Design a protein around this ligand. Structure first.
Ligand code: NAI
Ligand code: NAI
Ligand code: CXF
Ligand code: CXF
Ligand code: ZN
Ligand code: ZN
Ligand code: ZN
Ligand code: ZN
Lengths: 374, 374
């Protein structure tokens, strides 16, 4: 019915920063060589999407944001070999070209074809497939899932099991895999260790799930919103602390609580001051701290390098360290085999047309993940 | 003859910052329980000793500095079981109490009994064994080797092979083990990798030795003193670069040479701006950078956390990550089996009485290690 022809559908267009999303009709071009056009089934609201609205993350505007999603292939361009029409797929905000030095490295996953380091907001070929009111619209991280239809490059999409529940496994496209892998793969949390998780949203709850799966004995959740603590304990936190309850800096509180520092800390908020605090609260001689949260654009933190000279390890990761096209299908298969749970992250399910209500839920602190359904 | 008695001997006392050492008579008390009095045989001049003179590293003054050394036990206090009179020994600037959480951890080595985090300039019991002109003199890192005799706590000394050449193996007390271990143990340099070493003094040359021992394919030495390059190449550097030779910043220069960034980088100078440069020059997705150099006291560096979010790992270490009392004797044994070489590090030999000439050689850039003989 639509193969090869332009599709008119609705999408949520962000024309300016700090504005509501504009739900209107867009035109989606057919896929070119090695491109895939996807009909969306579900998309999650990740804080990184809100970072585009707030100016925390800079990407060319106007844009169709959205990147944590799942859908069904509508058509494929010339040369595509990894997916076919009717396939269930998850778009990959971090691609896996399989040919760059990073793709070939055994540990690396930040493929050099990403659109994060130098945001261009296009397809790999430098152009856009979206038009709205006659204007070209930018892509976001080579995904753009806030639309009934999107076009992605083949290296930015993974085929998943045909029996997958797409309204749950869309979280494997970002939030869950980021937090879970940050714990089990990047930090490599050890059994019986003490962990501190700063930020108890969708990604931080997934960090806790990973720390628990790795066998940590203590998991301390840190959040200034005490309404987050109940769910954090349900997924594995042993204790929760609110920094605003203390006179003392929270790094000093965590050090005392852990009898000299935690084994692993995670910053899953996106604040410079909490990145330094999370590093300081891990044990000075053998602690490991992982940055997951995204800081405001172009801002530098300040820290004393003696925190590292004593023995600490500080690292960060995109997408939990997972090689995206390899790992996403295996994570879906693991989910299906009930190896982990996604329902604790899903607090709200709304129709796509209520996208703005979903972001209001996030900004107000009331939601973890809202899933938008098409 | 001297057991149980105060020993009057000559030491290099630092009365004030930024002044020459004063070679003069001190009184060295006999060792108390679990203390060891050592007759010094040789001590190296490490940049960290000069950091005490310049105020870069703060420890209470007046002080007997020196920490990279080897000697012979003169007497032991009550309860000492690990060393006896006449034993050859190396003092440990980082102790190994064997009982704290760090000593019990498999990776950690920054024993909580250290005198670095919160310098007191005393023995473990809070007192001093040194008197000069009737005044108490501080210790340095629980070692104080710029003296014909010193007293150290049992956890700060290791017995070594009775046939050891003390005028060479004193370097295993700091410089060599720090650089070598930073490469083979902290970074865990892999075979065929590309390394960048910032700073080609005694410790940076030892990092190069460790990178070569690990099988690195390329080892890029970085120094603003081009006179350091010849020796760096002799011990394993494949290329040397002087940042002052380029119209662009050296991290860009190293990123171009490594076709996208190095596998392992090492800061072995002690400058805030080169710590950030060394981190920036590794692969953004899988590179590892190790801080070895000592920053000026209490100064903060400034960096963009996106350097870590992409996947980099940043860490630091004291003494190359080696558990000091376990490792020093083994390193001496390996040296005697010619598993590594120390002669390339020793450029100057002076009598202890010419200590100020030895520091002039270091400050002028002419020496790597000057060994002082008592
Ligand atoms: N590295 C990566 O690959 C990815 C990174 N992210 C980033 O991770 C971060 C978290 O994402 P979500 O979980 O979706 O966000 P979220 O907004 O749902 O969670 C943030 C949590 O931090 C808490 N918080 C805010 N300020 C705080 C403070 N000063 N102290 C303690 N807690 C504080 C909030 O109460 C909230 O619960 C965001 O910055 C996002 O951009 C998200 C996905 C992938
Ligand atoms: N972590 C630890 O356990 C230890 C740390 N250290 C520290 O390591 C550092 C090096 O010690 P040494 O090798 O003994 O010192 P060193 O002074 O002999 O070597 C430093 C080298 O850095 C070079 N350099 C200076 N400024 C530079 C710049 N802007 N760019 C490039 N190169 C520059 C100098 O030309 C010199 O060759 C010192 O800061 C020392 O305190 C030393 C021993 C143990
Ligand atoms: O949330 C998905 N991706 C993120 C990764 C970190 C930078 C902002 C975008
Ligand atoms: O050089 C020996 N020890 C050093 C270790 C890093 C801080 C200054 C002292
Ligand atoms: Zn996301
Ligand atoms: Zn790639
Ligand atoms: Zn100890
Ligand atoms: Zn030293």
């Amino acid at each position: 019915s639509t193969a090869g022809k332009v599709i008119k559908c609705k999408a949520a267009v962000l024309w300016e920063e700090k504005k509501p999303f504009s739900i209107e009709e867009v035109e989606v071009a057919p896929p070119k060589a090695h491109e895939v056009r996807i009909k969306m089934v579900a998309t999650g609201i990740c804080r990184s999407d809100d970072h585009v609205v707030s100016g925390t993350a800079v990407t060319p505007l106007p844009v169709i944001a959205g990147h944590e999603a799942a859908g069904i292939v509508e058509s494929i361009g010339e040369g595509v070999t990894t997916v076919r029409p009717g396939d269930k797929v998850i778009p990959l905000a971090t691609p896996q070209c399989g040919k760059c030095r990073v793709c070939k490295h055994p540990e690396g996953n930040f493929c050099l074809k990403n659109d994060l380091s130098m945001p261009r907001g296009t397809m790999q070929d430098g152009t856009s497939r979206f038009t709205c009111r006659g204007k070209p619209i930018h892509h976001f991280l080579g995904t753009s899932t806030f639309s009934q239809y999107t076009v992605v490059d083949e290296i930015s999409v993974a085929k998943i099991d045909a029996a997958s529940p797409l309204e749950k496994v869309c979280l494997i496209g970002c939030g869950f895999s980021t937090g879970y892998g940050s714990a089990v793969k990047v930090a490599k949390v050890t059994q019986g260790s003490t962990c501190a998780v700063f930020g108890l949203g969708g990604v931080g709850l997934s960090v806790i799930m990973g720390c628990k799966a790795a066998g940590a004995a203590r998991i301390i959740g840190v959040d200034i919103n005490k309404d987050k603590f109940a769910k954090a304990k349900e997924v594995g936190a042993t204790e929760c602390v609110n920094p605003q309850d203390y006179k003392k800096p929270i790094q000093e509180v965590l050090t005392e609580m852990s009898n000299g520092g935690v084994d692993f800390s995670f910053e899953v908020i996106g604040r410079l001051d909490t990145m330094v605090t999370a590093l300081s609260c891990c044990q000075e001689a053998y602690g490991v701290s992982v940055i997951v949260g995204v800081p405001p654009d172009s801002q530098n933190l300040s820290m004393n390098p003696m925190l590292l000279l004593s023995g600490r390890t500080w690292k960060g990761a995109i997408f939990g360290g997972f090689k995206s096209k390899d790992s996403v299908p295996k994570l879906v298969a693991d989910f299906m085999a009930k190896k982990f749970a996604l329902d604790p992250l899903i607090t709200h399910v709304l129709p796509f047309e209520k996208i703005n209500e979903g972001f209001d839920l996030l900004r107000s602190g009331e939601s973890i993940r809202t899933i938008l359904t098409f």
